[PDB]
Every structure is written in C-alpha cells, then in structure tokens.
C-alpha cells in the first residue's frame, strides 16, 4: 500500500469508488478539491483513469 493525493472534479468524482481498486480514503480536504488515499502500489495506473480524477501525486 502507498499514500497518494488525488486532485478531483468534485462534481464528477466519487470517493466510494476508490474501494473498487483496493484503496481507501484517508482525508478529504475541505478547502481544495483533493483527497488523500491509500492504494496498492500497482493500482496507481487505475486510479489515474478514474471518473473525476484530474491528477495523482505521490506523497513527498
């Protein structure tokens, strides 16, 4: 499992959908449209293609 931060279009992204690729939500930002998620390392590819997903960034 790795921690990544996803930048999303709120109107088009569903946080429940991260379970579908084996991940879970850690924190949903109140001030920016982004969410911290834990996903399997091999799932970063799939996450990138999810509905409403604009960017996936590694935790630095």
């Amino acid at each position: 499992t790795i921690r990544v931060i996803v930048s999303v279009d709120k109107a088009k992204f569903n946080p429940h959908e991260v379970l579908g690729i084996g991940g879970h939500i850690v924190y949903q930002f109140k001030l920016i449209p982004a969410v911290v998620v834990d996903v399997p390392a091999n799932a970063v590819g799939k996450l990138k293609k999810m509905p409403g997903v604009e960017k996936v960034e590694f935790d630095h």
């Binding site: 924190y27 920016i32 960034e57 935790d59």
Partner: protein, 318 residues
C-alpha cells in the same frame, strides 16, 4: 528556571523597541506554526498557546498528547516567535502573540507533504472548523473568524506538488502571510514551499551578519539563524542553527506589523508580492525596511536583507 535573557537574534531584528507599541497581544491575531508540536506547558510559552492540533498520518487530532512535541524543533521555533516577556528564560519577537501549534512533523522532525497541506488547511479553518463563518470573504483579520494571520513553516522539500500549491493559494487568498525556511543545503534557490511566489523565503545569517554557508540562496529576506537560544523540551532551553531558526524571526515581525496595524486601523495589511517595494503591503514593508546587506539591493545571499521590526512597524503605522 533561569533569569530572562534577550537572545542576540531578537535584538538583531529590532524587536524590543516595538513592544511599547504592541507585543502582538491583539486578540484577532494568531500565528500558526506548522512543525513538530509544542511543549505546551513550558512556563515560558504556555500563556500564548491558543490551540494545539495534530495532522500526523492524515488524521486531525486536538488531543494534547497527540499535539505535544516529541522532537524539540517546534518548541524552539515557537519560543523565537512568542516566548513570554517575564522574569525567566528567553523572549520572542512578539512576546504576547497567540500561537496555534499545528503538528505536521513527527518525533523525527520529518513530515509528509500530505500532513503539511492538512496543517495549512487547519490554520485557515481554525478551532471552529470553518474558514469564513459570516461569508464576507474576509478570513485573516476578521474578528468574527478564528483563522491565523501568519503561517510559519520551518520546513521544506524539493518537490513542487500541485495540491500543496493549491493549499498555499487558499491561505494566500484568505489574506494570510506565509513564511517558510529557505532550506539548509547551500542550494542555489529555496526549497518548497519557500520557492512559491505567495510565500516569503527566509535565509539565515550568523551573529557577524554573514550569510550562513548552509543557507539556500535567493531568499526573499534573511534573519538570525545561527547560535539561536530558545525554548526546548522539557521546560528547558537550547541553542540551534538552521533556516528553521531564521523563519520564526520573520513570522514574529509580520505578527507585530499586523497587530500594530489592526490596533490602529481595525484592519490588517494585504500580503503583497515578492516585487513589492511600497509601504502598502506586508511584504512591501518588509522589503523596504530590511537592513540591506552585501551588494546594494536584493542579492542572492540576503534577499532584500535582514528584517527589522522597529522600522517595519513605523512604516506600517506612518
């Protein structure tokens, strides 16, 4: 507890002469320090700790045991901003300012960008969990809200992440002055978030007015960052060096500017930009009142120069 001294850096940034005007104890003003946490019961700090929060591992906690400093770095930085002016220990640049201690770094003094971004969000939201309660677009400086007016980040890294930048943009749009360490690698330019245009990059000088060799270059301003005595756990004091120690001197000067301005005018100043050289903006004021060391003008070692609180406050109130 030892008898109070004024550390050399506090004298250097010309803070003591400001105190008769303000010590920063204007009720709408808070400084959020995003660091390793705080020794919240330290006798030379306690009275100024207004809120203690932790964002470690992406969970927000206001539990004292989660927000307590396990490293020392946060306690040291906070003491340079806000150590009390009394009979003991040391004294901060703004010895009456309220502090929000936001723990984004762990026992190691290491932290994730995710936890840092959450920390910035907590500084904007404040204890009430809402950025703009009355919906008027005024956040920093609105006495109806509880947002911080200064975010102080004695930390940095090499990555420029989009979400972290978006969070910096949100703080900047809330009217918050953002101050961050240039970094300690002797690099040609500052670390992030210092390197963002919305953020004041702070380099370190020593007590001879020489730039520290470790100090990352092209800062916006510089400040005392070598042989800095401050508070340290548990209820003690320690001397350290780094751009992490320079940062809080600048954050304190900002806190005095905004406190004095609100005390006189019932508003705060706009944050301003890197290029600003007017008296109409916090950063403009910092730049024109800084002690211009090295070559004339902004230079890659000192930035615009060493911050000076006494002159900055006079420029603000003039």
């Amino acid at each position: 507890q030892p008898a109070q001294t004024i550390p050399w850096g506090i004298e250097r940034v010309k803070a003591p002469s400001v105190w008769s005007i303000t010590d920063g104890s204007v009720s709408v003003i808070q400084v959020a320090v995003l660091d390793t946490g705080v020794d919240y019961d330290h006798p030379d700090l306690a009275a100024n700790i207004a809120w203690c929060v932790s964002t470690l591992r992406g969970k927000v906690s206001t539990k004292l045991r989660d927000c307590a400093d396990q490293n020392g770095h946060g306690t040291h930085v906070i003491g340079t901003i806000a150590a009390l002016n009394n009979d003991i220990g040391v004294v901060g640049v703004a010895p009456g300012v309220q502090i929000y201690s936001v723990r984004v770094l762990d026992a190691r003094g290491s932290g994730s960008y995710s936890d840092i971004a959450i920390g910035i969000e907590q500084a904007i939201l404040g204890p009430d969990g809402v950025a703009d309660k009355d919906g008027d677009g005024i956040i920093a400086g609105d006495p109806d809200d509880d947002a911080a007016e200064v975010i102080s980040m004695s930390l940095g890294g090499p990555a420029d992440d989009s979400y972290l930048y978006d969070m910096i943009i949100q703080a900047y749009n809330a009217g918050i002055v953002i101050v961050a360490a240039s970094g300690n690698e002797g690099a040609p330019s500052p670390s992030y978030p210092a390197a963002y245009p919305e953020v004041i990059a702070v380099g370190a000088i020593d007590s001879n007015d020489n730039i520290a060799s470790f100090s990352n270059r092209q800062p916006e301003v510089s400040a005392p960052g070598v042989d800095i005595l401050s508070t340290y756990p548990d209820d003690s004091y320690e001397t350290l060096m780094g751009t992490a120690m320079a940062t809080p001197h600048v954050s304190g000067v900002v806190a005095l500017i905004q406190a004095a301005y609100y005390q006189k005018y019932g508003k705060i100043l706009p944050v301003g930009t890197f290029d600003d050289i007017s008296k109409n903006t916090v950063r403009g004021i910092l730049h024109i009142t800084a002690d211009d060391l090295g070559p004339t003008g902004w230079d890659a070692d000192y930035g615009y120069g060493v911050v000076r609180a006494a002159l900055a406050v006079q420029a603000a109130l003039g």
